[PDB]
Protein backbone atom coordinates (compact mmCIF):
# COMPACT_ATOMS: atom_id res chain seq x y z
CA UNK A 1 0.00 0.00 0.00
CA UNK A 2 2.68 2.49 1.02
CA UNK A 3 4.43 2.09 -2.33
CA UNK A 4 3.43 4.69 -4.90
CA UNK A 5 1.83 4.27 -8.32
CA UNK A 6 5.10 4.78 -10.20
CA UNK A 7 4.90 3.73 -13.83
CA UNK A 8 3.05 5.99 -16.25
CA UNK A 9 4.77 9.23 -17.25
CA UNK A 10 4.45 12.00 -14.67
CA UNK A 11 2.05 14.76 -15.72
CA UNK A 12 3.32 18.35 -15.78
CA UNK A 13 0.46 19.62 -13.64
CA UNK A 14 -3.30 19.97 -13.21
CA UNK A 15 -5.69 22.52 -14.69
CA UNK A 16 -8.40 23.56 -12.23
CA UNK A 17 -11.33 25.22 -13.99
CA UNK A 18 -14.22 26.99 -12.25
CA UNK A 19 -17.30 28.10 -14.19
CA UNK A 20 -18.78 31.18 -12.51
CA UNK A 21 -21.55 32.45 -14.79
CA UNK A 22 -22.39 34.16 -18.08
CA UNK A 23 -23.48 37.75 -18.69
CA UNK A 24 -25.12 39.43 -21.68
CA UNK A 25 -25.95 36.04 -23.19
CA UNK A 26 -27.55 36.28 -26.63
CA UNK A 27 -31.21 35.24 -26.77
CA UNK A 28 -32.15 32.44 -29.16
CA UNK A 29 -35.91 32.72 -28.71
CA UNK A 30 -37.99 35.84 -29.35
CA UNK A 31 -39.34 35.93 -25.80
CA UNK A 32 -35.92 36.70 -24.36
CA UNK A 33 -34.74 33.48 -22.73
CA UNK A 34 -32.61 30.43 -23.51
CA UNK A 35 -31.22 27.18 -22.10
CA UNK A 36 -27.45 27.54 -22.68
CA UNK A 37 -24.74 25.45 -21.03
CA UNK A 38 -20.96 25.45 -20.59
CA UNK A 39 -19.03 22.56 -22.13
CA UNK A 40 -15.41 22.16 -21.03
CA UNK A 41 -13.21 20.17 -23.41
CA UNK A 42 -9.51 19.52 -22.80
CA UNK A 43 -7.01 16.90 -23.94
CA UNK A 44 -9.30 13.89 -24.36
CA UNK A 45 -11.72 14.23 -21.45
CA UNK A 46 -14.70 16.58 -21.49
CA UNK A 47 -17.26 17.84 -18.97
CA UNK A 48 -20.32 20.09 -19.15
CA UNK A 49 -22.34 22.06 -16.61
CA UNK A 50 -25.95 21.70 -15.47
CA UNK A 51 -28.45 22.97 -18.04
CA UNK A 52 -30.63 25.80 -16.73
CA UNK A 53 -33.98 26.55 -18.35
CA UNK A 54 -35.91 29.83 -18.21
CA UNK A 55 -32.80 31.88 -17.43
CA UNK A 56 -30.54 34.15 -19.48
CA UNK A 57 -27.83 34.15 -16.81
CA UNK A 58 -27.34 30.63 -15.38
CA UNK A 59 -25.36 30.64 -12.14
CA UNK A 60 -23.35 27.49 -12.84
CA UNK A 61 -20.64 28.05 -10.24
CA UNK A 62 -19.13 24.61 -10.81
CA UNK A 63 -15.61 23.17 -10.85
CA UNK A 64 -13.72 20.85 -13.20
CA UNK A 65 -10.25 19.32 -12.89
CA UNK A 66 -8.31 17.94 -15.86
CA UNK A 67 -4.82 16.41 -16.19
CA UNK A 68 -2.16 18.47 -17.97
CA UNK A 69 -0.53 16.24 -20.59
CA UNK A 70 1.19 19.10 -22.41
CA UNK A 71 1.97 22.53 -20.96
CA UNK A 72 1.41 23.75 -24.52
CA UNK A 73 -2.29 22.89 -24.33
CA UNK A 74 -5.18 25.35 -24.60
CA UNK A 75 -8.56 24.99 -22.89
CA UNK A 76 -11.62 26.03 -24.90
CA UNK A 77 -15.07 26.60 -23.41
CA UNK A 78 -17.83 26.47 -26.01
CA UNK A 79 -21.28 27.50 -24.77
CA UNK A 80 -24.17 26.18 -26.86
CA UNK A 81 -27.96 26.33 -26.59
CA UNK A 82 -29.95 23.11 -26.21
CA UNK A 83 -33.20 23.18 -28.18
CA UNK A 84 -35.33 20.14 -27.42
CA UNK A 85 -35.04 17.45 -30.08
CA UNK A 86 -32.99 19.91 -32.14
CA UNK A 87 -29.22 19.89 -31.49
CA UNK A 88 -27.32 22.68 -29.70
CA UNK A 89 -26.11 25.77 -31.57
CA UNK A 90 -22.77 27.59 -31.45
CA UNK A 91 -22.90 30.80 -29.42
CA UNK A 92 -19.29 31.96 -29.50
CA UNK A 93 -16.20 30.49 -27.85
CA UNK A 94 -13.16 31.32 -25.73
CA UNK A 95 -9.54 30.24 -26.21
CA UNK A 96 -6.97 30.77 -23.46
CA UNK A 97 -3.51 29.17 -23.16
CA UNK A 98 -2.70 27.54 -19.82
CA UNK A 99 0.51 29.59 -19.68
CA UNK A 100 -1.55 32.78 -19.46
CA UNK A 101 -3.01 31.41 -16.23
CA UNK A 102 -1.16 33.53 -13.68
CA UNK A 103 -3.39 33.74 -10.61
CA UNK A 104 -6.88 32.70 -9.54
CA UNK A 105 -8.30 36.09 -10.48
CA UNK A 106 -11.71 36.58 -12.14
CA UNK A 107 -10.64 37.43 -15.69
CA UNK A 108 -13.52 38.05 -18.09
CA UNK A 109 -13.14 36.32 -21.46
CA UNK A 110 -15.30 37.77 -24.24
CA UNK A 111 -17.04 35.10 -26.30
CA UNK A 112 -15.21 35.18 -29.64
CA UNK A 113 -16.43 33.15 -32.62
CA UNK A 114 -14.34 31.23 -35.15
CA UNK A 115 -13.36 34.71 -36.33
CA UNK A 116 -11.52 35.62 -33.13
CA UNK A 117 -10.48 38.66 -35.16
CA UNK A 118 -13.67 40.26 -33.86
CA UNK A 119 -16.24 39.74 -31.11
CA UNK A 120 -19.69 38.12 -31.12
CA UNK A 121 -21.96 39.22 -28.27
CA UNK A 122 -21.68 39.67 -24.52
CA UNK A 123 -18.88 38.18 -22.43
CA UNK A 124 -18.21 35.42 -19.90
CA UNK A 125 -16.47 34.99 -16.55
CA UNK A 126 -14.31 31.88 -16.12
CA UNK A 127 -11.89 31.29 -13.25
CA UNK A 128 -9.01 28.93 -14.02
CA UNK A 129 -5.94 27.87 -12.04
CA UNK A 130 -2.60 26.36 -13.06
CA UNK A 131 -1.11 23.68 -10.80
CA UNK A 132 2.24 21.90 -10.89
CA UNK A 133 2.81 18.31 -9.74
Domains of the chain with bracketed CATH: 12-133 (2.60.40.150)
Q: Collect all residues with Cβ–Cβ distance below 8 Å to 72 and sequence separation of at least 6.
A: none
Question: Strands across the sheet with 62-68, in order?
Answer: 62-68, 13-23, 123-132, 107-108
Instruction: State how far the Cα of 61 lies from the Cα of 56, in Å rounded to an integer.
Output: 15
CA 16 to each of CA 62, 81, 104: distance values in angstroms, whole numbers, following the listed order: 11, 24, 10
81 labelled binding-site residue: yes
45 labelled binding-site residue: no
103 labelled binding-site residue: no
Instruction: State how far the Cα of 59 lies from the Cα of 56, in Å rounded to an integer.
Output: 10
Contact 68, 98 (CB under 8 A): yes
Instruction: State how far the Cα of 37 lies from the Cα of 60, in Å rounded to an integer.
Output: 9
Q: Name the residue among 116, 97, 119, 115 with its Cα closest to residue 107.
A: 97
Please report which helix (H) or strand (E) contains residue 132, including its range: strand 123-132
89 labelled binding-site residue: yes
Q: What are phi and psi of 32, to 5 degrees?
A: 130, 25
11 labelled binding-site residue: no
Amino acid sequence: GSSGSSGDVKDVGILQVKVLKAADLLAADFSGKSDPFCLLELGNDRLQTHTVYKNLNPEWNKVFTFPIKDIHDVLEVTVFDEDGDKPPDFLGKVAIPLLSIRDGQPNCYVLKNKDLEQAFKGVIYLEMDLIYN
